[PDB]
Amino acid sequence: GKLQDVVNQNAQALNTLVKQLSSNFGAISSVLNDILSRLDPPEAEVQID
Amino acid sequence: YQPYRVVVLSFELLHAPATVCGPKKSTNLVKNKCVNFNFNGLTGTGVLT
Amino acid sequence: ISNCVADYSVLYNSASFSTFKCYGVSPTKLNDLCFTNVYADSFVIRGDE
């Protein structure tokens, strides 16, 4: 179990990092390709930021 | 006080098959070579198999 | 409005509109987007309102 905890913490701290790519953070959408396809530059720079 | 003629358009961007679409020309696809695909507006880049 | 094709490139170039404001979508990029359903509401309201 001592060796399993290290694996169970690395693989879990990575899932939480990967799953954070699908959060809006206050923007219109959480995927970047779908923001540039429906917003002009001067008002898309604030949604990206 | 002059009368103005007002129309409001709202777009449903839910997850469903697309019915209303813009004036674009569909092109035949290629496989095993990543392309800037635009399936119903799904912008991306990757090979198709 | 559904099960159809809609053109927005000439919508701004069709005639003279006092107010053409879009929220969340850039009007120039409306020519390459697909929507599940589109709604339209019509009425008459004075200019100051």
UniProtKB/Swiss-Prot annotation, chain B:
Domain of life per record: Viruses
Where is the segment annotated Disordered?
Answer: 15-37
| Description of how the protein assembles with itself and partners | Binds to host ACE2. RBD also interacts with the N-linked glycan on 'Asn-90' of ACE2. Cleavage of S generates a polybasic C-terminal sequence on S1 that binds to host Neuropilin-1 (NRP1) and Neuropilin-2 (NRP2) receptors. Interacts with host integrin alpha-5/beta-1 (ITGA5:ITGB1) and with ACE2 in complex with integrin alpha-5/beta-1 (ITGA5:ITGB1). May interact via cytoplasmic c-terminus with M protein. May interact (via N-terminus) with host bilirubin and biliverdin, thereby preventing antibody binding to the SARS-CoV-2 spike NTD via an allosteric mechanism.
Give the protein's function. Answer: Attaches the virion to the cell membrane by interacting with host receptor, initiating the infection. The major receptor is host ACE2. When S2/S2' has been cleaved, binding to the receptor triggers direct fusion at the cell membrane. When S2/S2' has not been cleaved, binding to the receptor results in internalization of the virus by endocytosis using host TFRC and GRM2 and leading to fusion of the virion membrane with the host endosomal membrane. Alternatively, may use NRP1/NRP2 and integrin as entry receptors.
The protein's name in its UniProt record: Spike protein S1
* Part of the whole protein covered: 505 to 553 of 1273
